[PDB]
Specification:
Chains C, D: Its EC number is 3.1.-.-. The structure is cut from a larger assembly and holds 1 copy of chain A (about 220 residues), 3 copies of chain B (about 290 residues) and 3 copies of chain C. Chain B is of the alpha/beta class and about 290 residues long. Helices cover about 45% and strands about 15% of the residues of chain B. Chain B has 2 domains: about 80 residues, no CATH class; about 200 residues, no CATH class. Classes of the chains: A alpha/beta (about 220), B alpha/beta (about 290), C alpha+beta (about 100).
Chain lengths: ~220, ~290, ~100, ~100, ~290, ~290, ~100
């Protein structure tokens, strides 16, 4: 994947982990504004290997790592649908689940018939059992280093998002933690792009000078 | 590394921040990569990631896969920076015939001694005294065949004179089942040692592929015949249920009371180290 | 028993489209997966579940609706080829198969 | 080898309808019989004729056209049920079968 | 199996009803195991189950695990492919240095002859005549090192005098890649034969697990050298794809035109049979 | 076969791949032969092939051909249903008049008892008296004709004193229709047994091909009399349809609840076995 | 009556761990709260409920499981104090 703006001479490719440093505060703030306004503004563009423009729905932009909720309505919907598909791939297990649900429905139905008030029921479904169990991704994160790892896991799980972008998220992690994040990104194959106001020493990064010239580093 | 990580339960494995993440339904455990030495997977329900496999290739740790029978099937072979076990197999190819005959004779002596001692616990003095006489009469190269002669006395004492190993019965199938479980455990220990199980201690018969582990598991064999003697009236399913409790039951090692897995592990390690060092000490196990 | 199911019906009217959406949602709720338009399949555990599924499908069929049910083995299901004017890979005898970049 | 073939394609444009008529006439000329809308089948003598038929179908597929090909035995073909919202009798286990007045 | 399945994409793999199940968010596809020969995982984001690994070990399918760079990292080696392995180990220990040096010398003669045939097809009379002279000058124990000289003159004539095998260029990278793939297939064939892969037929001092498979894979190197020579101007990715096209292409064996996997299997079978029978017939492969 | 296929419509019938092929201008349908028990052609416009007739003879499926009035005209009788027929002919010629008169007397007692049970269930009382007392009064050779008196009192009590069996009314027409269908099924069962259908167990002077099948079908007449009594007000077409519903309905045998075809087959089997074994056990059928 | 309950058992085997989880879930379902590992308490209304609870605990005790039961007053139950954590050489740093 490649990103292109009017400041660059040629579009630079983003593969696996990528660190982009902008030495101009105006170009950095205007670039983040172009990231949040990407749907509104046509200046900033992104061309994949197919050389096709992507909608903002396919771009995942995350600034605050701790403030980003892992559990969402769409994420829980895709997770519950995934578990329902996994249970549907095995006929015998789903048959046993239908038998147990039939037994529980028979017991609760008998208790309802024992009551003096009329009771009407419909049925119990596997999706209602998963939602009743509260299946969700683990919400336990001790540090931002683990939270960003969970963000990379959910990002690699989401097929619709073709790119994940972090804005000034590298200032929290130590150099060694940055090395572990880059190695985990290379192992996960996902495309991650970082935007930093200042350069980081010891790691390979693309430095954008105030002259607008882009140069590789390490 | 030092600790040997073995997974007997359903679980998933991941690699994050130089940390192996093992996730099971009960709890999640994170283990440092430098602490792990050998990795073994007991069951077929374990899930692993190719990234963790690559990290294991960089860490040189040996990956062992097993089938539903728990017998080790395949192992991970890296193209570079190979593990030291592959260098240790050459010593197994260099094992001398004198050391193999000494360890084999010691193993047969331990098994026969355990059979006679078990017959003494069953309060048959004549049969246990005969098996003990055959134990004191055992010699190298086995010209007397006192092991095959002690067999018929042991089985005839246990299950009666009418019973035999050749006949088809739930008792013989139970004995083959217990020998299959013990062969799986000892074979897993030999696979952990890295030595090829196709090379046996017995020089006569190479037919079996498990010959090394089958020869190492002989001193622990009578412990199965005891439970098979107590439960002999029960159906083969009940005999399998009783034989399945041997993993939970604890036995007395010479040093201390231990589980069967640790005892078989220490015995196998002493056997391999003794074979490579040419008979420093022979591990002895008594019921 | 592999149950292959085709579904067609006149879609012109709004009520017909609503009935089509309802029937499709009912098929998805019952465990059926849509391979393509009008094409669906579901794995039935045994003959009893297959008969009950046939009765349920007859009960839930919309007005003017038409559904074709066929019974197929796993070997025939893996031999299913779908050509879009791109054909299914399982029918191909090609030696090398690339899930990834085709280069 | 019993060849079951489903055919779908957007019919909106006039060129698309003409292409659909041409493809259907080509299917009828090749020996395929239409059981219902988008539903067809043909009996192939052997695997060679089946492969040649697959290549011909890929060559004659119209733009936007989609064709699903499945291989089925005679026993599965006789077990084929068709339900028109009225289900095929072959799937029914009914003891008495009336071709005639149902009274 | 006839089919080489390469997975470069993130997905989950399961085993259902003797069928390999590829599950992804975009699509799911099932491929039968009997049709699958080799399974290659080119990325670290792929997930697999130990049950599918056990089914692959029982199906005797080579599983290759690559790195993030896509270069192969580690391949799965089954412990017991067939019961004839334990019986073949005794024959491998009983092999003679005359049979090993003879078969290895004939194999090196076939490799140098294949290089002279490649230079002859490339219309170099002086280079193929010199390599043919080294082929006629090859002797036991290799005192003149005519094989290494044939390789140095081969690569130096093909890629230029400034080229060398110790360079880091993508040419040597693709050469080591093709040698790693062919070494993996030949090593899997040696695992099918059951003989020890670590024991080489040339130098008993060199200890490597890939030594034997390399000695068996020596005559087939020029096939990789041809595509490497044609695609040398192309990028390493296209060169890797052209290297993957070798499995689809067919080559002419002395008997008839066959696939590469069948030629390697039958060639390794004739090599093992010739080693056990002490040089009854030596299989010869020509371009 | 479990299925009774009735074709009232013009069409062509062929035999393809062990499948009955119904070909018509409006639609074509294929029905497997193993599921088909009885084939009924109710019109004269149906076409069939002699190959399908041969496949129906090999499948032992009863084929009935009706007239333009839809009343059955002629049914197909296979020459050899099974090889045991030629051996059973000698036993039928060796039968004794005591066994024939005994089995026939017991069968007539079962029919009169079933009529008394029908009147008892219909709550027709003193009619069930005359029937019951006639049943207790039945004797060998039938000198009192209590069977004919039981039939006359049965029909005269059910349909009224003015009713008679010699009338041309649709009641007697439906009675003869049901007796013709049940006589066709019982005759087909006798063809399956192999014994001669023309030889009766009651009167050796009366010569008719349907005599034996009528003697076996005597106890089941009241089942037709019930539906004929309920539908007597309905038109002859609806009465014929209700008569066709008897094949779909199930009846309770002494052992369990079974279909009419299975009860007729097992009943005829027990009757033939009782005739060959000289009255070992007499099957009894009750409403 | 305030019931203080201690629970211990060998956890080594998998069956023993499963039995421990089952017994703990049974204690939570009966109204007992875990102040710490092996440490639990529950407020019993009277002596009858205490006796029935003793019988139920004896019935639900896992194999090799050991339970210690002590009666404490409600005011003494509130008096429960939970503490959660002389060297010559004190080392702040690497412990060598």
């Amino acid at each position: 994947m490649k990103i292109n703006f009017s400041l660059l001479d040629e579009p630079m490719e983003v593969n696996l982990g990528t660190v982009l440093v902008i030495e101009d505060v105006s170009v950095f703030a205007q670039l983040v504004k172009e990231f949040y306004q990407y749907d509104e503004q046509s200046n900033l563009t992104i061309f994949d290997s197919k050389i096709r423009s992507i909608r903002s729905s396919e771009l995942l932009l995350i600034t605050d790592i701790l403030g980003y909720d892992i559990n969402t309505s769409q994420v829980l919907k895709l997770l519950h649908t995934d578990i329902v598909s996994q249970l549907n791939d095995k006929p015998e297990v789903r048959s046993e689940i239908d038998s147990l649900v039939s037994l529980i429905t028979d017991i609760i139905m008998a208790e309802c018939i024992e009551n003096e008030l009329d009771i009407e029921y419909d049925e119990i479904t596997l999706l209602e059992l998963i939602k009743a169990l509260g299946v969700r991704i683990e919400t336990k994160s001790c540090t931002v280093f683990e939270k960003i790892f969970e963000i990379l896991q959910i990002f690699k799980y989401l097929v619709k998002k073709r790119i994940l972008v972090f804005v000034n998220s590298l200032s929290y992690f130590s150099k060694d933690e940055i090395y572990q994040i880059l190695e985990y990104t290379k192992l996960s194959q996902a495309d991650v792009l970082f935007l930093e106001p200042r350069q980081i020493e010891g790691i390979q990064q693309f430095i954008l000078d105030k002259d607008y010239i882009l140069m590789p580093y390490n | 590394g030092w600790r040997t990580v073995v997974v007997n339960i359903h679980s998933k494995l991941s690699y994050k921040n130089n940390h192996l993440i093992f996730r099971n339904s009960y709890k999640t455990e994170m283990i440092h990569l430098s602490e792990i030495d050998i990795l073994l997977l007991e069951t077929t329900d374990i899930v692993l990631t190719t990234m963790l496999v690559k990290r294991l290739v960089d860490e040189n740790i040996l990956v062992i896969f097993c089938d539903d029978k728990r017998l080790p099937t395949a192992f991970l072979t890296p193209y570079y920076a190979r593990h030291d076990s592959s260098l240790q197999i050459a010593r197994q190819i260099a094992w001398k015939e004198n050391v193999k005959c000494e360890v084999w004779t010691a193993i047969i002596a331990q098994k026969i001694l355990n059979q006679s001692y078990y017959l003494g616990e069953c309060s048959f003095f004549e049969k246990s005294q005969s098996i003990m006489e055959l134990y004191h009469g055992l010699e190298r190269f086995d010209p007397s065949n006192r092991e095959g002669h002690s067999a018929r006395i042991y089985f005839n004492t246990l299950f009666g004179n009418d019973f035999t190993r050749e006949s088809d019965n739930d008792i013989n199938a139970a004995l083959d089942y217990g020998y299959t479980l013990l062969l799986s455990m000892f074979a897993r220990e030999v696979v952990v040692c890295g030595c090829m199980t196709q090379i046996g201690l017995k020089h006569a018969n190479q037919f079996n592929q498990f010959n090394l582990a089958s020869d190492i598991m002989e001193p622990f064999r009578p412990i199965i015949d005891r439970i098979v003697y107590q439960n002999r009236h029960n159906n083969f399913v009940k005999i399998k249920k009783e034989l399945f409790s041997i993993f939970s039951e604890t036995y007395l090692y010479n040093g201390k009371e231990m589980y069967l897995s640790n005892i078989v592990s220490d015995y196998t390690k002493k056997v391999i180290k003794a074979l490579n060092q040419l008979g420093e000490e022979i591990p002895e196990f008594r019921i | 028993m592999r149950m292959i199911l085709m579904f067609d019906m006149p879609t012109d009217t709004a009520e017909e489209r609503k009935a089509y959406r309802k029937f499709r949602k009912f098929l998805l709720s019952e465990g059926f997966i849509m391979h393509q338009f009008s094409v669906y399949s579901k794995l039935l555990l045994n003959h009893t579940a297959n008969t009950a599924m046939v009765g349920r499908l007859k009960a839930n069929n919309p007005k003017k609706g038409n559904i074709t049910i066929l019974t197929v083995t796993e070997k025939q299901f893996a031999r299913m080829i779908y050509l879009y004017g791109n054909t299914s890979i399982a029918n191909s005898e090609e030696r090398l198969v690339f899930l990834g970049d085709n280069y």
